[PDB]
Every structure is written in C-alpha cells, then in structure tokens.
Design a protein around this ligand. Sequence first.
Ligand SMILES: Nc1ncnc2c1ncn2[C@@H]1O[C@H](COP(=O)(O)OP(=O)(O)O)[C@@H](O)[C@H]1O
Ligand SMILES: Nc1ncnc2c1ncn2[C@@H]1O[C@H](COP(=O)(O)OP(=O)(O)O)[C@@H](O)[C@H]1O
Ligand SMILES: Nc1ncnc2c1ncn2[C@@H]1O[C@H](COP(=O)(O)OP(=O)(O)O)[C@@H](O)[C@H]1O
Lengths: 36, 439, 426, 447, 171, 114, 314
Amino acid sequence: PMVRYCSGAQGSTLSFPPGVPAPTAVSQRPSPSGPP
Amino acid sequence: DVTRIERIGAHSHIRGLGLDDALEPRQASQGMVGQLAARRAAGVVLEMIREGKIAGRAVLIAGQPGTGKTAIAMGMAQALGPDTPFTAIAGSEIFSLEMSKTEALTQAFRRSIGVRIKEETEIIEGEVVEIQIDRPATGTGSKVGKLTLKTTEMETIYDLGTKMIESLTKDKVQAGDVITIDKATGKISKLGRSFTRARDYDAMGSQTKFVQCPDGELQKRKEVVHTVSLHEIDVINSRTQGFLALFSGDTGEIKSEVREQINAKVAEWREEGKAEIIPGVLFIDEVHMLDIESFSFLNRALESDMAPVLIMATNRGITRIRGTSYQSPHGIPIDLLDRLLIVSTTPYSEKDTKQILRIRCEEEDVEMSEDAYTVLTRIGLETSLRYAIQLITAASLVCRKRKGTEVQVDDIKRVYSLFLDESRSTQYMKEYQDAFLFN
Amino acid sequence: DVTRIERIGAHSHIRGLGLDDALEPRQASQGMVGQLAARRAAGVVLEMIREGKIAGRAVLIAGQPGTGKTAIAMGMAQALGPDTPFTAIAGSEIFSLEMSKTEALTQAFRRSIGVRIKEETEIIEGEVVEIQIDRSKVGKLTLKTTEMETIYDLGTKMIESLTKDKVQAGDVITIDKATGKISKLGRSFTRARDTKFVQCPDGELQKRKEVVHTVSLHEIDVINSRTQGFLALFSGDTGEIKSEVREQINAKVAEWREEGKAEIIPGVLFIDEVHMLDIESFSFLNRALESDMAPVLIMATNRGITRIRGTSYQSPHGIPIDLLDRLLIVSTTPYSEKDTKQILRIRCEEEDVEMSEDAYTVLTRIGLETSLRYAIQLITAASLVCRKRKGTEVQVDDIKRVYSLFLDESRSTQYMKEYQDAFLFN
Amino acid sequence: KIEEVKSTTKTQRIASHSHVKGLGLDESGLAKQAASGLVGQENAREACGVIVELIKSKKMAGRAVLLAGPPGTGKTALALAIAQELGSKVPFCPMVGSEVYSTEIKKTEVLMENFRRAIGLRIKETKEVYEGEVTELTPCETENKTISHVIIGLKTAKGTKQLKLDPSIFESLQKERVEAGDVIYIEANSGAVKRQGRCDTYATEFDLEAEEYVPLPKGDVHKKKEIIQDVTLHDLDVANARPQGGQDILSMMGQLMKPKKTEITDKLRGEINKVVNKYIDQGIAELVPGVLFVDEVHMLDIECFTYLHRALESSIAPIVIFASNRGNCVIRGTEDITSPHGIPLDLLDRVMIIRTMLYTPQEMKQIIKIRAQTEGINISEEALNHLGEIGTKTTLRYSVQLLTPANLLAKINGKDSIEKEHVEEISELFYDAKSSAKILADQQDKY
Amino acid sequence: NFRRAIGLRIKETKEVYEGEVTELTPCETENPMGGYGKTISHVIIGLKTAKGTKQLKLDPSIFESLQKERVEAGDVIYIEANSGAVKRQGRCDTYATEFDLEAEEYVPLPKGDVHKKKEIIQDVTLHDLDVANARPQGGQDILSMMGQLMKPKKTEITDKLRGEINKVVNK
Amino acid sequence: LDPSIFESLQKERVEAGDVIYIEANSGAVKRQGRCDTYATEFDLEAEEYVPLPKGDVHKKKEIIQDVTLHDLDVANARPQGGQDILSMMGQLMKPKKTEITDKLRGEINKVVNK
Amino acid sequence: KNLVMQFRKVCNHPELFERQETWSPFHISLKPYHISKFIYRHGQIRVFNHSRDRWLRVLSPFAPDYIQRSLFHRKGINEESCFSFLRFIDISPAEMANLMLQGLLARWLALFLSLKASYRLHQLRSWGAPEGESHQRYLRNKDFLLGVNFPLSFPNLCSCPLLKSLVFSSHCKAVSGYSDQVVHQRRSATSSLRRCLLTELPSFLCVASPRVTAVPLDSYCNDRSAEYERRVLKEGGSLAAKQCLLNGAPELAADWLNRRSQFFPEPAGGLWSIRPQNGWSFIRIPGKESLITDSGKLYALDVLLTRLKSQGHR
Ligand SMILES: Nc1ncnc2c1ncn2[C@@H]1O[C@H](COP(=O)(O)OP(=O)(O)O)[C@@H](O)[C@H]1O
Ligand SMILES: Nc1ncnc2c1ncn2[C@@H]1O[C@H](COP(=O)(O)OP(=O)(O)O)[C@@H](O)[C@H]1O
Ligand SMILES: Nc1ncnc2c1ncn2[C@@H]1O[C@H](COP(=O)(O)OP(=O)(O)O)[C@@H](O)[C@H]1O
C-alpha cells in the first residue's frame, strides 16, 4: 500500500501502487465564452 | 577599502595593559602608555581574575577626568581576551523599567560568570544522492524511507527513522543538496547544492551559489565551546520555551527559587566535569551613578561564591551619594568603599601626553610633522587630553581637503580656531550671556 | 508534640477582649489584663459590630507604643469570633504597585462586609454496598446507613460519575445530587479488612440539608470581573475593579436585602498603623465611611502631633482633622508596675515557662525601665539560658545574663555614642 | 608495581565569609576565643547561641534580633554563622533590605514572600505511577465522537499490564507524541506524562533516527513511592496563584507566558495555612520554621518598617535577623526623622539588639591568619605582623583584601609564601577608603 | 537611536514565476517502476502573463502543495524561485464576468514574462535587525501568535543580541 | 423561536421536559432544572428537578432601563468578552481600564443622537 | 562513620545503598472555590443585567448598519467619518462588528487569515509597479496595510533568502548566538574550523523545576447548569477555541488530522508547534550518565575503557 517519493539522483519521481487513486488528476482550461 | 561594524572608537588603539611576564609596565606597549602605578595594579587584579580562585573582589579605578581610568578597564578587557566574560555597564544602565535596580545588578553580576560547556557530537556530512520516502495509502499512517549520501571518497545508504523523515521533509532536502546531520539530535543543516546537477533539473525549485561536495569520511565528529553565562542559564530556566528572552530582554525579576537552584546545578556540572564555570569581570563604568539602594545591594551581592570580580571607574571628589544628601569619597558609600581596593590614576606629563597622541596617530593612519605634534602636545596640556585627541582627526581631514600628505602645524592652528575647547566655549558664553537661555 | 503553622507570637496569648456581661473588665481574663478604660470602650465598639445596625461608625485606638492598642484590637478580633468578617491590614499595605492606593482601601472595606445566604441542598450519603454497570449505559447502585438500605437505578450522568471516580463496594460516599460530584470519605469499618476508615453515616440516605453560606461583598465584585474572575480572589490580579460594576452589585445586594433573599453581615476593617496613609487615602476614608455598606473601621496609631504623609501640615495622631472629626478616639494609657508584672505572668504561662517571684520582680523593673515589649522578649531568651544551664526555672541570674547579652534601644543608643564616628551617616 | 591517582576539576571558589563554619560555642553556650572560623565577638556569639536554640525550639514566631555595630564588625558574618549552626534542613533565607523595591509587586508584599519562604515544610508525598514500554494504545469513543477512556498496554522487565486511563491522560500522551515502543512514565496524582524515547529493544530498527533509547523499566508497571519533599510556605503560596500543575490548555500556557510576580491575596495564605495544618494533623508533614535574614535592614522604606509591625506580630512568622552598620541616620522615606541604626523607634522595641563591636590589633592579626589559611596562602610572621599594623592604620576589610593580591605578587616574584617585601608593595599599589580620601580632598579642584 | 544611525545596504536577487495557470498536467513516465501502478516524473504548470504563455516543468511534490492551496485552472499564482513554495493570489480578472457574484477579489493578469528577475538593494538600520530578532514575525508558533495578539512593546534589548548581530553582519 | 435562540437552548443543553426561562427581548435563556414530573425517570440522575411553575407561561412589564454614556464608552471601546463564559480565550487577556479615545466618544455621541 | 559491607557498597557505587529516586514536584491540590447556587443564579452581572447589556450593543457604533450608514451614506461632498479606514484595511463592516462583538477567538481567526493574506499582498506590492491601479488615481483596498513594505517584514524576509539569516532568532529554536565550530575526521585525525555559524544552546541546560505544581484552582457550584459550564471549561471552552490554542487555528487542526497523509507537511501552529527540551512535565528521571558521575571508581573505569577501546585491547 506504500505510495513512494523518490528524490532520485538524475531527477525526482512520485509513485503510486496499483489501486491507489493516484489522486493528482490533471487540471485543464475548459474554454470560456468571448465578449461579456 | 571595506569597513566592518567595529571602527576607530575612543579606545580602539588599546590592545592590552602592556605588562611584561614579571608584571612590570613598559613605558609604551599594546597601545597603553605612561600611567605606571595604575597599570601595574590592574596587572595584579587581571592576574587575580585569570587565576579565578576567589569571589567577591572589587576594584575602584579613580582619578581626574581624562587620565586613563576607562583606558585601563577597556585595556584589560583585551588582555583578558574574548574567551572569558567581561561585561561593560555604565552605572546609568541599571535604572530599568522592566525590573528593579537590585535585579539589574543581579543580572549584570550573573551575566559576568561564564559556564563554558564543550559540546561534541557525531555528524553525518555528505551530498544527498537520493531520498526515498514511503507513505501508506491510509492505514495507521507511519512513513518509512531511505537516504543515500556521498563524499568525494565514500558512499552509504541509511534506512531512516520516523523523526528523521519529518525533519528531512520539513527542511525540504532534495537530491544534490549537501547536508550536515547531527546524529545525536536529528537536526538537519544545509550547506547548498553540489555543482553536478546543472544538466538535469526542473524549472527552478531552489536557487543559491553552489558548494563543493564534502571530502573524506562520511561520518565526522564536531566540537563546539559555548560560553553560556549564568544570567542566560537563569533566563532559559525561568519558564518553558524561554529562549527568545535571551535576546528580547523580556524577563524581569527572575525568581530567587530559580537562581538558588541554578547555583546548585552549576556546582553539580562543575563537580561532574560536565561544564567549566569561569569567573569573569563586571566593569561598572561611571559607578557614581548608582543609588545608595544599589550600593547597599553591592555590599551583599559581592559575597556569594558565584560573584564575579568587579571593577568600577569614577571621576568624582567628595560628592553626595546619589539618592541621598550624604557626602562621601567618590560618591560611593563607605559601606562599599571599605569593601574594595582603590587603584589611583595620575595626570600626564608632556612626554606621556605627546606619546599618547603619537600612538593615536598610528591607529588613525595619520602622519603629522614633529612641529605639529609639538603644538598639539601643548594644546593637550593647556586643554584636556580628549580635545587634543579629537583635533588629530579634524586636522587630518582639513589636510586631506587641501590634498596634503602630512598634517602641518598650521592645519592644527586652523582646526583649533574651528572647533572649540570647552574652556574657550565657556568663555565666549560670557560675552553673549544675555542671549543664551537660563543662565 | 507537633507544631502548628500558628505558634506563640506576640498577641497569641490573647483569646478574647476579657469582659463581664455588663461590659465591665475584670483585672485579667481571656488572656489580657489592665486597660480597664480602653477595654470597656472596646467592649462598646464590639457590641456596635455585633449588632450591625449603623454603617461606617469608626474608632481610633491611640496611645504610647507598647500599651496594647494592637492587643485590644486582637482581643476584639478573637471575641468577635468567626462568622462576622474582620480584615486586619497595616497602613502601608494599601500602597499597591499594581492597583490604585484609593482602590486598595475601597477593596479592603468590601472584604470586610459579608453577604449571607442559605440554600436547600439534596445530599445522598452512605456506604456503597453493591454497584453494577452494563452497555447507552444502564446501571444500579446500592447504599447503606447505620439505619437503612436502598437500591437505585442510575441515570447516564451518574454512570459517567460513579465509574469516573472509581467508586467500589465498601466505600463511604457523599453525593451532591444536583451536580453528581462524589465526595468519598474512605471505606466503612465493616470493610476495613482487605485509605481512612470510618463508621457508616446515620439517619436516612437522602438528606434535604440546609447550607448557610457567606461571600464577601468584594468577593461578589471580583467574581463579576472576568471569565473566571474568582481566580483573582486568590492570585491578586484584581487591579482596578470597575466602579460602575460595584455600583450595580451594591444595587443588586440592596434588593436581595429588601426582598429577604440575603442578609448583609457587617464586619470590621482593622487598619493598623493608620498614621501613614497619605492625605489622599484619608480623603477617601472621609467619604467612604458614609454609605450603607461601610463596615466598622477600627484604626490604631501611636503618634503625637505629626506631619501627615504627602503634606507639610502637622496634625494630631498624624491624621487630618477631616477624619478625626468622623471617629471616636479610645486612649490606651501606659501600665503600672502590678499590671506590667501581670502581663509578664500571662506571657510566661503562654510560653510554658516558670520563673521565681523575685525573677518576676526584677523582670518587672526592667519592663518599667525599658518599655515592656523588651521584658516580654527577655522571658523567651532567659528560659532558653535555663535549658542550656540544665535549670528547671528562670532565676534572677538567667535574667541578668540575658539582659547583658541583648540590649534595649536606649542602652544600645548609649553604647552607640562611644563609637559615634565609627558608625556611618549621622 | 605501578601506582596511579586522578583528579580533573576546580574547587569551590573562596568567598568573603567562607571561613565561617559555625558560632564556635562550647557545650554551656559560652564562646571559645577562636573556633569554627570566628574569633572575638564573645558577647554577640553567646547571644547568637541563645538564638540558635530559639530557632531550634520552634515554639516562637516573629521574634527578631538586630545585629548593630560599625562596618567590618562581623554582623553579616554572625548571621552566616547562625546559618551554618542550624545545618541544611532548617531554611535560612538571606535578603538585602534594598530588595523590597520591586517593579512588579508592592514593597509591603516582597517582605511577605521573603517571610513565607523562611518557613520550611517537609512532606512525605506518596506518588503513585505507571511506567513501561507502550506495547498498546487505544482511545474509547462516546457520543457528543468524544473520548471516554484510553487503554494503554505497558511492559517492564517484571511483566505487563493493560490499563484503563482518563482522557486527560490521552490528551497528555498525544501532547508528548507518545507511540508504541516508547518508554513512558506517568504519575497518577499529577496526571503528568514523561516520554523517555523508544525502548533499547528498538535501537537496531533504523540506521539513522533522532531518538535517544533507554533500557526497559524495572519493577511492576503500577507502583507507589514516597518522595520526602522539602518545600516552603511561599512555594505553596506562589504555585497556586499562577498554576503550572494539571494538564489543560490553560496550565500548559501559564508555563510559557512571562513569569511576573503577583500581590498574593491574604485569603490564599489563609487557605494554604489550613491545608498544611491538615497535612501536619495527618502526620504526613513536619514544619521547620526557619530564619529570615534582612541584611542592610537600615534601608527598608518606612512603609516596610511599619509593615514589619504586623509581620513580626503574626502567629505564623519565622524568626528574623536584621543587621545595621549605621548611626543616627535619617529614616528613608521620612526626610525629617532621625533614629538609631536608621530604624524607627517603633520597630526598635520589637527586636533584641545584639551589639557587635570593634577589634583589638590581636583579633585583626588572628582573623587575617584564619583568612589567609582559608584563601589557601602561606604568609611569613613578619608580613602578617605588618598586615596587623595596616589593620590598626586602616580597617579589617582592606587588610584582609591585600592577601590574595600579595600572593599573586609573591608567585610572580617566584616565592612560595608572602614575604614583607610583597605586602609593602601591595600597600603602595592599592589605596584604601581613608588614604584615597586624602589625595581626593587635596586634589578636589579637579574631580 | 545609536543603532538606528548605522545602515546595512544589503543586496540580493528576487526571482519569481507567476501567471494565470492554464493547465496543471501531472506528467507520467512511459512505464511505472517495479511494483508500482504509475509514476509522475514531473508536473507541468501552464503559466500565462500579458507577454505570453510558458509551461514550467516542476518536481512531483508540488502537487502535494497545489492541493494544500486550492489552485485550479484560471487562478493566478506565484512560485518563489529561491524556495519552491507556491502561493495562490485568486481567480484571474478574465473570469470576473462569469457570475453576477462570487466570493473572491479577482486579480488582474500579470505583465512582463512568466519568469521575473531583478537584483534589489535593501537598506536596513542595525536597529531593524535588533527589533526583528527581538520580536519575530514568523507567525505559525503559539508564542508568535500570542506575541502578536498581545500589545506591542519596546523591550530592553540585551548586549548579547547586539553582539550576535555584529558577529553576523561582519560575516 | 429564531435559530439563534435555538442555538442558545442547545448550549444550555435543553431537552423535552426541562423547565426553561426564555426572555423574548434579550434572547436570554436559562435552564432551571428538569420538570419534577420526570423526577422518577431514573432513581438517581445527576440533575435537579424543579416543580412545574405555579405561574403564567407569559409575563409582561414595561421596564424602564437606566444606562450611562460611560457604560456605552466602556462596553464599545475594547472587544467584548463575547461569550457567556463558555470559552477559554477569555482566560488569557485580563481586562484593564484604558484611555478611551476622544474619537470614539465622538461616534458614541453621534449614535446616541441617532 | 557517624557493618563493613555498607562501606564497601558505598565505595563501589552509592546506587547499591540508596537508589536515586525519580524526583517530581509536590502536587498540591486545594478544595475548589465554592460558589453557591444563589450567587451563580442571581449574582452574575453578565446574567442579571443581560437585558441592559443588550442596549450597550444596540447603541454600539460597531453595528454593521451604522458602519454602512457612516461610511457610504454621508451628506457632505467632503465629510469626516470614522470607519473610513475600513475601505483601506481589508476589513468588511460585518468583519469589524464580529471582531469587536465576538471576542478573542474572532481576533485570533482574523489574525491567522491576515498572516495568510500578507504573502498574497507582498508579491503584488513588490512586482505590480508599472502604470497604476486605475487612471493613476484612487487608493485601492489594502493600501493602508503598509507594514509589508519594510525590508525585514516576514513576507519579504521569506521572499528574499539572504535577510532570513540576519533574522535568525525564530521563536521555537534554542539559538545561543553565533560561534565557530570545529570538525574532526576519523581518517588521518585531521580537523577544520567552520567560522561563525548559528548554534543551539546545549540540549541539557533546562534543569530547573517548580518545587510545587498546583492544580488550577477550580470553582465548584451546587447547580446543574453551573456544572455543565465548568465541564465545558475543563474540556476546553469550545471545539474552535481549543483547536485554535492547541493546533494554532481550526484550519491547522483539520490539516494536522491528515498531515499523516502528506510528504511535505507545514509546521503545527498551536501548543503542538513547541517541543520543550524535557517535554511539558516536570519530573526529573535520573539520566544514565549519573552512573558514571556518582562513583569515583566508575568514573575512573570509564576513562580506562574509552582508552582501551581506542587502543583496540580486549
Ligand atoms: N594610559 C593611556 N594609554 C593610552 N591611552 C590613554 C591612556 N590614558 C588615557 N588615554 C586616552 O585618553 C582618552 C581619555 O582617557 P579615558 O580613560 O577614556 O578617560 P577617563 O580617565 O576619564 O575614563 C582615551 O582616548 C584614552 O585612550
Ligand atoms: N493589656 C494587655 N494584656 C496583655 N498583653 C498586652 C497588653 N497590652 C499590651 N500587651 C503586650 O503588647 C505587646 C505588643 O505591643 P502592643 O502593646 O500591642 O503594641 P501597640 O500598643 O503599640 O500596638 C504584646 O506582646 C502584648 O502581650
Ligand atoms: N569575628 C569574626 N571572626 C571571623 N571573621 C570575621 C569576624 N568578624 C568579621 N569577620 C570577617 O571580616 C569581614 C567583615 O565582617 P562583615 O560581616 O562583612 O562586617 P559587617 O558587619 O559590617 O557587614 C568579613 O570577611 C567577615 O567574614
């Protein structure tokens, strides 16, 4: 059940075991309307 | 070129009492000159301070204004060195609003006893090659993890504990940081990044100058000596988490039940060999400012085995003891004056006065002609010494304004006409007497 | 024997202002002797306090030093007893660094007038015989007195009290029923096998007790000052309690008096050494004695026509005429030989020390020559010389020894003139 | 074959009264000529011989003495002699008269803190305690969830237990960050928890951890012991006025804020007196009423001298020692009034005065000898005879004060002992109050 | 007043990354490491300002602070480049029309690049250093909060704080 | 009742069968005890049982309150204690009398005129 | 001196003769202060004047109605009024009323949110320099919050990494001041000096304790509702007020309950921000070094064994 953070030698990495939600979901811009 | 916080003060040329190893004063040495009787005597009390065998000792340095009383005291403060506590207090400074007069003296006393503690611990000092932190999905929630560390010679892997993990992540250590961990305490400390990771990185999560990877063995010991004075041991003990009051000045009137407990536990730390109690000096400069209430505390504070040596200065004749109408020598009550040794300073000759001005120009980086020193010596005998001392700077600045390399007699005649002696200002105040207020 | 906190101090030999039912003093009783005029005068004041009908009535006990003006005030404090307040303070005790000098008198007055109430209370008491609990929770308790038994079902807020205070079979407990506090009293003597031990309570288990209670008027002023104001009764944090709060608490206590919900119990403010209140403090006493809830003010002083503090003016007793005009002065005249001997007898009988009749005679000469309080101190020291000598009784040579060891102020001043330039500042 | 011996640390420091070890009386209470560090003062020592039996008798309250006599006559040395003669267990409370001028509390109340500190009390406090490695830890829930109990499993070399404890103990365990494997100590009377780190069994479990580790506790988990506490009535008075006991958010924070003094109410000293009387009735307590030594009493304010009339007449008060070095002064705070010793005649009845008196040359030589062999120094008889002459010329304190400076000069000069050639130099380097006042009166135009 | 009349003139770089956040893409490796479901090698944050948009690659640990904040696409945010702390200012002024009421002060879009740098010269008296050490402002300690809710006061600063400040400004 | 009076019933720990005093102006609420018709609900419970009131459910007076500008100045100058005890922040800061500014008294005057 | 085995035991170690006790302060507790049901019911001015205390609040200028009416509904083209500064501090009229009428809890929560808001204000204030806030006129909201502009203000001191080292004495680190520190290597026995670095004070220097530690003097009362009020006080007066002192704000409590689930959690703010050198309790367990320092023989043995270990001898 161990989520793991590797501050690795060449670069960092966060890791989730299978079935943990990996709850860092993406966030994006759904496009707004034009003029007020 | 660059200028530090301490600069050319009134006593910066003094670097010790200028005694030889048989305790005789040289005519001019370590910046002090002339004044043989009082420097010799201060040598004996300086040796008594440094011997440290006996508590409750008081010395009064006495004599005319501008005759080296403060010079001797601020001089033996250098010969005693920085490793042993010397506390300079003007007698004005005990008049607190956070605490009584007898408290402010109990602090000035106890701030003048050192408790020298040598602390040693194993430290781990390396470039961080990696950190692994493992966290359970929810559960009981205990984290676990590993750290890999490197020197220019060596490498190892540590399976971390729980308290180490919260310190490493609190201090946000990352791969390529160089760190120094106190293995006895779990405190991290950070030196900076190693140079090697200019190649692979993110958009900047930290920025500093880089530092070289640490050398040699990964585990090394460190030694610190702390000269923690008794007053700051009382403050630390006065309340839980009291540490800021050491700087803030916040604690008034600390409990007697704390002090009498610290006086026991510091004796135990001496007998355990855990700490070196070193007696210091309290220099109560201008002590004629103490109230008779404060002097009566000095009668009886000065008799504990935890009392420092104290030194006092005064420039007062028969005068009324502050807070009373009673006249006494030095403005000090005979209760205290009976309890101390009086070191008496002497006015200067021409030879000594010239020689003081000559060591002063050598500290200020000033060149003067022998003609200029001659006139300035005459000025420093007709007027006080402190005026002649001050004209050296003004004459060097006037000389520099005319782009001269060496101060001449006419630069000093110029400056003497420009900045007044007290005795000349007090004379011109007679011819404009109606124009000045409240004569 | 063990020693109390309270030991044989200067006035500890006095246990009342010794008087007949007719307010005439007998020569020596209840510990104190002589002063027949001032004891009769103090008896009349003690009856004014004990009756309580007049507010702010005041008396000044004045006389030469060491003539019993503190003594009769202590005899009066003992004869007044518990249950009516008596606040002793010294004149210098109002000079707070933390609170106004004028408020500290306002406060001291109000410590000394009680408000008394009585309240009906439901108390259970008994040996707990058996106690049962099970899962909310349900449970059942039994109690026994010397004269009855009961079984009680328990409500949830008793379950969370009998369990919380670890009550067990064979304990004796008192329960304030309205609150559920368990005041335990150890274990019963029939379960002293396998803590104090005690006999079971008598009578019935549940008593409608009536509790009398007394609260100082100041102590109502302080409970009203903060979130837990009552700590400032003890801690001394009670600085400058706001006068518009006192104005409301007096209005509230007045309507409790008129409705008969409470009764005010006027005590004594005994301000000792009065001659060193400032003229500001005497001005406060001039007006503060003129209100329904002013207590009886007893004042003591031992000064001639003297400069009153905070001023250049001289006045009798070191008190301004503004205040002396508001009070009755009782005058304590100095002792005869026979009274002085008799004071020394009662001090000896309080200290548990014997001395010969000639020892009492020379000690009386010393007492007349050197103003009495010194001769009382010679008793204490002379009887310690006997104990070092292995003597059973103070003889004249024990007194003449101690009289040569310890000086009175007049001989000490005479031996100060042989060294007049060796002592400092004169 | 070989022998070795070791020592590694400094002594106690020498101090201005450290030669005084007791009054130097005989079995009859007469003064020996020179004993226990003191010499001379036979009347004042015989008098203090009565006073040490006065303290030890316990019967008396607020009895007082005034040591009176010129500067250097030994008044504060005799109060120190009394403090040694009583031993450690009876409290001796030193005070200087100018300590009453606090900036936190009234002068008229600093005296009461000093009085109440001088009445000592010895208490057989039974403490009952839980200690062990925490092997299990669980809170038990109840509706508004709230905590009703905590269960702690504790382990020691002698066994294990699993205890129901109050939620105030759980709040304390959370405050102390206690977890399984931690060695802990709890005292059930204070409700107070101490963590000691993980048990030594876990010292191998990590390569790098912040913890100190301790051996598993011994004896049963639950046990009770007497602490024979020494305490004073002041230490009861103050500890209730700003309470640091208990475990709640408030008491946990009165332990952090600036420790200001406070004007303790007379009511609290009343309720404390009732509580210590109950501990004496229960046989749990012994009272040890001791001594308050107001040195330099001549500068209490007249506020304070008039308060002492109420304090010395208390049935509770300790025995009191005053000292004064003063003649017919003005009394402080009065500006007009003059009286012997600087003390009001109104207070000067309430004291047994102990006259202390000037020294013969023979007593000065004998004090200077006893002092020299206390400062740890050897002095030649011709040099000690010369210090005796300086005693007759000046004062006992100046003559004593030359000793260590002369020993520093001797070891600089390479001698093992003070020769007259050393003292005769130190006398030229360091003036005294009399000789300095001559040059300071002659040169009075320039100071 | 003696300590007010002595000034440091101390100089340093300020660097900050700021803009409207147009995306937060937790960016995965092609495969997980052994025994793991997925791995994030970096977050990509799509900051925008009136000069342009640029993606910043960031350490995966930044997401465990963006969700301690309440950062969502269309906020304006900043990151202290020397310290890696991310802070939210509020929804960008671009969205101020999307409700008739919403309970936040909408913040105007930054101008200049997403990455800002300057050196700045800061002048402090040694008395500012006396005060800031004598009464710390770093808020999240119980004694910092109690010291900030209590009345402010001047306090009798020790010669030791003067000594320690002198020993560091000389460094 | 408004919801703020109900919060006060809930702070007084009131339940059905308790004897309550409500004041409709002040919004003051006091629990006085359980009604003694429920005094048999358990044989011992840690409550006081009061007899059902021998008086009107609803009482009126035209009271005529007296208050002074200094009561207003003081009760508006410092932040109030704010809670009916029922708090412990109010343990830390002891009150003191304070130099109420002439600018506050300006607003108290302008409000009393209103 | 004042059998033979008792001397031998004392020569070997005094722990053989009298074991050093775990000393702890005397724990006195007094009877609680008894307040009658009568004084509790009728004698509290907060209660018996509650109908009058309402009018002190109805006539308050801090009522949000009068703030709004004083602030925006003025008559003069220019006109002085109080609360004008509430347009330039961030504070709302009802924030000012709640902050005045709801006591030191509302003060504390409003402070914790102002600490948060100062970091948002600072990075605006220090970079938004060009053009102007509108038409190069109008003061904006927060323009009177100037205490962020000092170079040494906590937001700027956190933003610029250099000054953070001149403001060294933070409130929960036991810093002694600066010293030199010397490091020794095992290989070659060589050593080097680190010049002027911060030091903690020695970890053992807190050793005083009160001789006596009394229970806080509680008040007891003969009334069911008075018992509930003291039970609320000994619980800690409310969930918010307790979390606010204990964890630093009720947000920091809700976060601290799940800092368990985070890699890089922030510091706790309340009493749990502190870890004092001994823990909060005053008991003085005898440290294991007291074995070495109580016996002359065991002290002599320890210098022999530390030598013999370093020589490699069994
Ligand atoms: N013996 C001395 N050697 C060197 N400088 C001296 C000596 N005596 C006096 N001075 C200088 O003269 C000035 C005044 O002397 P100082 O000791 O400070 O005055 P004071 O005697 O009144 O205390 C200082 O600049 C000091 O350095
Ligand atoms: N009438 C008395 N009966 C017994 N003792 C008395 C009496 N009058 C005075 N004393 C003694 O007075 C001593 C204290 O001095 P006191 O006379 O009360 O002082 P003052 O009158 O100045 O207030 C006590 O030891 C007490 O025994
Ligand atoms: N009788 C004595 N025997 C031994 N030492 C004494 C004696 N009298 C005085 N001293 C010592 O001489 C010095 C002066 O006595 P001290 O008690 O300080 O005088 P004072 O009463 O004026 O305060 C101190 O060092 C003290 O210990």
